[PDB]
Design a protein around this nucleic acid. Structure first.
Ligand SMILES: [Mg+2]
Lengths: 95, 234, 125, 167, 142
RNA sequence: AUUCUGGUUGAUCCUGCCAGAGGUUACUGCUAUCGGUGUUCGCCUAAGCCAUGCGAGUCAUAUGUUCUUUGUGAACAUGGCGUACUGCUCAGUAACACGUGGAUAACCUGCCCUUGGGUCCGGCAUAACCCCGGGAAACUGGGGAUAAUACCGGAUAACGCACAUAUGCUGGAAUGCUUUCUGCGUAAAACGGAUUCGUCUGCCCAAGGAUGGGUCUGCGGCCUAUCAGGUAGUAGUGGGUGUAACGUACCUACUAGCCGACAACGGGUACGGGUUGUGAGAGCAAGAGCCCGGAGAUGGAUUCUGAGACAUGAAUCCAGGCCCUACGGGGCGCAGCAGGCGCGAAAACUUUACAAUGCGGGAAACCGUGAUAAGGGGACACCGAGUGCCAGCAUCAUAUGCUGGCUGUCCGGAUGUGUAAAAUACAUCUGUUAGCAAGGGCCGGGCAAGACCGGUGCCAGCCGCCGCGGUAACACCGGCGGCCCGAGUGGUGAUCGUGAUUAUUGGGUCUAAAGGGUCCGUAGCCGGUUUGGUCAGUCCUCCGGGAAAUCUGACAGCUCAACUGUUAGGCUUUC
């Protein structure tokens, strides 16, 4: 599975990084944890800190849209991000 | 106090997508016809917050200012020539009406800049005051030098007078309606044509024409005193 | 309560068939007529928190001399006459445009007591 | 309300012998399925023809130049008319160009399948792609620029050239 | 029919009066069709069969046309209904529930050599009488 | 594609309709794999009646009380705001109701907005709680304690009279604001709450705006004469009354008008428009759904509360039906969402979630939301696909053959993307002997298809129309065969076109239906050449408008597609 990132705008009004990238996966659309693990090494973002909102794969060609995000605080994520995103994004040791 | 997707105003540039209501603007100081929500502005034009909840959060946390006033409500109206200031990037934007009568935003350079208003009805508050029918900011309750339609300029956020931009024959003028919106040009003849409706005005910039006095803004002496046009960012 | 809605035929006598009910904003109150008695008023409310003062009885007036422009309060004794109704003179009703009799002199009521809350009468010259 | 009626048209008398013969010949030649497909292709044809009539009535004005050039630019994009064409060339437009712009016709004349219906099944069964897009639509409307990049899909078995039914 | 420039009123009046001589427009505006027909604009109906009559055909032709006599429940209107197909009276008897529809003949009226009959059966006990005539459905015992 | 075909005749021309042929709409017979788009699915009968759940609730930074899971955590009470906005329905309404252009200098506005001020003394109930209950319930009593942005009382304005005082707007234009002050009657607030004591948010007030709504009038749009007079508060003047405000809206004195034959009054019908159907167009027909305005809440009247209502989740009574009762009494009306009975030709789940978009609540964190979104179900409308492909070989030229393999768009599975979470969709893989996935009408003419074989004998039947059968039925029934359409295909209405069969464009009227018996003659309508003047229709042009939506084309983006955004046009019209 392969990833290339294009847009990394940082919102000054919240102190978070907007991660936009193209998922050049092969065959099976990768899960959110796997895409987070791959996207972490591209910009030095921990799993608890790096957050992804969608890995949306298109028809036909094995290319997907990844709208990931980065925060300088997990409490900031819990204050801003929705609870379904926090559940959907597995924390270190999460259940 | 609702408004629907289809019956969105003609001055609202945002499309007709979604599900019925699109962010009902308050009563506010400005007219509802030439007004956009600050939530809709920050969620469509600038793209600093995508959700309505996150927009309400960022507004409520004192992060966006409208002429130095950090409004916490996402339904605040915006009129023409309004300045939005964001200190964290030094992003300055001005409400402008393009050639189709719609409201857009032009980016400015400096964070600190004046705002332009206009005179609409000079009344007399009791106490020897010449009330100018002000609607926003602070001002000066002045004298008979301040006539109707004089298009005063005032600082931000203290809103003190910078320069009385009184109109005469030949002075600059910006259109605020019709098919000539945004075609700023010099005044040619401001004729006080007596009639039951309202008077008229002659203006010619790039091309000459006749325009109505309620569709003219006295926006400068000979050149733009305010930062009229910067960068048209969607 | 009275109905002040637009209900009196069209121009011809064709009876107007109402398509709407008696709306709340078309309901007018009763003509609280004023007489010569103990000075009595009521703070009836109206639209938008505007409690209009309605007078009912009064034997005093604010007679206003026109010769010197001096306003002095003198008692009302009798309505001399009235152009509006020939019966209010007999009833001692105090409507605007009537003529009262005071201690200062004969005066004409120049204020509507049912809307003004006072009886302001101009002293006739 | 705001709903939509059909796209194609219908004959006033529905059993014209020579007209039905031409319809069956076009359907069998180009590998079509429905009579309404030919009807809708002729409806796009008469759309271009009616736009041509509306423009050619005036005989090109400050804004009619735009309305008369945008259609010609789009058709040169799609190539239904000649490359060195004018407004008037659209008036003499037959539906073979429209059927040619159909992707089944394009793949049939690109030699990616022996027969037209085999081109149909190859396009629908992911055997025809364009730069990674596994498009499965016979009714796809492609450009001349679109035509060159067309090929087998990288996942479909015909990308490997071992197919016996394939040439 | 005045051809002057300022004569639109006369042409409008004379077109207004001449329109009434058409049967269709006058009968549409006057509402004779809604007032007349038992179904009242309903495309089909539902009536209780009462009596069965094999009514005769026209003068040149010669035949017996099986026509049930049915009274509607929506309106209580008594009419005559023609039951088509071979074995037509075999699948319908007295006191049934049968859908009825117009025969669809001349001007919406009676069709063919059937005199005085304008309604036809289309289904007996909410099942298609055409399929019973064909032989793909069976008559319910209800 | 600006379309013709059969029928009256022994045969022709023709007037003339009938029927044929295409849409669309409603309903429906037969029948059937799937996806996409969104603005459809109890309108047409019953605006009939409703069991059940639910749809508006929120406020710890207003006050007050008991716990703790110690936290903007919950329960109770006083109190503020909100529920008058959305949502539904389409009865009434032929109307300033509506579309559209103006007006309000004739008016009200809680929330919101900016500037100018102020935020002053007090008084002290009554809540939950305590003690006792009454009551079948609905409801709800007494005594004891007490608080607030609760409520009451007091000081500095507005309101109305009369004045003098300078352009301040608008400007034909004061009648308003007013510098005003004068005296005469004549008023408000919570120095509340929190804090990081930085400040934030609230109360009163004045001016204005904005928002909401009332009022107002030029103009635009039904059938009807087998509907000719209608109107007395009706038409108007003065003075009043009430109103938020103008007003016969009501009252008084008076005048004798007002509308109508260029259609008043009455009947018929109808939610209006944006628009929709259809046609080459002129037109013609309907305006259920998406948006704007209107009205309605079982029929009806009346009223409280509020800035705003005569309130869809307020009351009161009458009519009407129904309902819980311990028989003393007490409720209810789904034209709010699913659902039920009834009704009929005539339509769904008593699913999911506040994730988003909005709304009210909160200072905030946030909570509620049958609004909204998400689905389930209904041959809704449109669009896109597939059930086959396939070389070689054979007869009766396209059917199963014989054989050869080959693909997975469909169906089933796996796994992840994915949504609030689902499902579909989406990607790889892989399941298939390509087998599971086609029907529907019709075959004499009109009209594309059989003069092939038995049946029946003016019978059974067919038949939009024409026309068939009493003995050789290409006609009818099974068969055989064939034809057209296509997950669709027919039926009956309707309606448009056909049809120049309503004709201004664009028809006829000697003999086919049709010139009035003749004639005189008003409104209407049509009008000589000609000089002089105007420019109202008209003409070119300008400026204010004519909401979006839907329409057309393209671009951009959904895989093509329809569809969403930008944009150039259209309509909006005919001010
Ligand atoms: Mg009140």
């Amino acid at each position: 599975m392969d990833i290339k990132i294009l847009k990394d705008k940082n919102n000054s009004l919240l102190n978070r990084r907007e991660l936009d990238f193209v998922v050049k996966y092969e065959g099976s659309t990768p899960s959110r944890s796997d895409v987070r693990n791959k996207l972490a090494a591209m910009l030095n973002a921990p799993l608890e800190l790096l957050i992804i909102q969608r890995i949306k794969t298109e028809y036909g060609m094995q290319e997907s849209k990844g709208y990931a995000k980065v925060y300088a605080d997990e409490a900031r994520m819990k204050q801003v991000e929705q609870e379904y995103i926090l559940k959907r994004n597995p924390a270190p040791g999460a259940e | 106090t609702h408004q629907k997707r289809l019956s969105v105003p003609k001055s609202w540039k945002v499309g007709k997508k979604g599900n019925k209501w699109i962010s009902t603007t308050r009563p506010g100081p400005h007219s509802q016809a030439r007004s956009l929500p600050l939530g809709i502005i920050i969620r469509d034009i600038l793209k600093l917050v995508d959700n309505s909840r996150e927009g309400k959060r960022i507004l409520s946390e004192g992060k966006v200012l409208v002429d130095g006033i950090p409004r916490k409500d996402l339904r605040f109206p915006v009129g023409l020539f309004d300045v939005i200031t964001l200190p964290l990037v030094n992003e300055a934007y001005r409400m402008l009406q393009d050639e189709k009568g719609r409201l857009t935003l032009h980016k400015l350079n400096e964070t600190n800049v004046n705002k332009l208003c206009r005179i609409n009805n000079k009344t007399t508050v009791k106490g020897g005051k010449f009330q100018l029918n002000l609607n926003d900011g602070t001002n000066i309750i002045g004298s008979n030098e301040y006539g109707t339609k004089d298009s005063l300029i005032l600082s931000i956020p203290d809103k003190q007078v910078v320069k009385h931009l009184k109109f005469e024959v030949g002075n600059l003028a910006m259109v605020v309606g019709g098919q000539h919106s945004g075609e700023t040009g010099k005044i040619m003849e401001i004729r006080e044509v007596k009639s039951s409706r309202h008077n008229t005005v002659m203006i010619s910039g790039e091309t000459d024409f006749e325009t109505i006095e309620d569709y003219v803004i006295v926006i400068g002496e000979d050149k733009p005193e305010i930062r009229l046009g910067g960068e048209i960012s969607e | 309560m009275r109905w002040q809605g637009s209900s009196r035929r069209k121009a011809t006598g064709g009876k107007v068939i109402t398509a709407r009910g008696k709306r709340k904003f078309e309901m007018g109150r009763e003509s609280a007529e004023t007489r010569i008695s103990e000075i009595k008023r009521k703070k009836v409310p109206t639209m938008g928190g505007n409690r209009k003062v309605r007078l009912l009885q009064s034997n005093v007036a604010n007679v206003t001399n026109p010769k010197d422009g001096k306003t002095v309060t003198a008692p009302i004794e009798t309505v001399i006459d009235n152009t509006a109704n020939k019966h209010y003179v007999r009833r001692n009703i105090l409507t605007k445009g009537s003529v009262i009799r005071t201690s200062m002199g004969t005066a004409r009521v120049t204020s509507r007591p049912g809307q003004d809350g006072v009886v302001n009468a101009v002293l006739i010259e | 309300p705001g709903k939509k009626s059909k796209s194609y048209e219908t004959p006033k008398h529905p059993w014209q012998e020579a007209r039905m013969a031409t319809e069956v010949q076009l359907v069998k030649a180009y590998g079509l399925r429905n009579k309404k497909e030919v009807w809708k292709a002729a409806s796009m044809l008469r759309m271009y023809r009616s736009e041509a009539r509306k423009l050619l009535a005036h005989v090109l004005e400050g804004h009619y130049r735009t309305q008369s050039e945008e259609i010609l630019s789009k058709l040169i994009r799609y190539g239904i008319i000649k490359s060195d064409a004018n407004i008037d060339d659209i008036l003499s437009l037959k539906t073979e160009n429209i059927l040619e712009r159909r992707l089944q016709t394009q793949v049939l004349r690109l030699g990616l399948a022996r027969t037209v219906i085999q081109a149909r099944q190859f396009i629908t069964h992911g055997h025809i792609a364009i730069n990674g897009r596994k498009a499965t639509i016979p009714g796809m409307l492609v450009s001349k620029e679109d035509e060159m990049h067309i090929g087998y899909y990288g996942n479909s078995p015909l990308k490997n050239e071992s197919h016996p039914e394939r040439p | 029919m005045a051809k002057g420039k300022y004569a639109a009123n006369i042409l409008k009046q004379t077109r207004k009066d001449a329109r009434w001589k058409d049967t269709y427009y006058g009968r549409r505006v006057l509402g004779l069709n809604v007032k007349a027909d038992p179904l009242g604009g309903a495309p089909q109906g539902r009536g209780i069969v009462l009596e069965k009559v094999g009514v005769e055909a026209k003068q040149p032709n010669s035949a017996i046309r099986k026509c049930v006599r049915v009274q509607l429940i929506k309106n209580g209107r008594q009419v005559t209904a023609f039951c088509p197909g071979d074995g037509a009276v075999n699948f319908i008897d007295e006191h049934d529930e049968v859908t009825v529809e117009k025969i669809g003949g001349r001007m919406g009226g009676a069709m063919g050599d059937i005199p005085g009959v304008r309604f036809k059966v289309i289904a007996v006990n909410n099942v298609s009488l055409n399929q019973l005539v064909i032989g793909r459905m069976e008559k319910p015992r209800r």
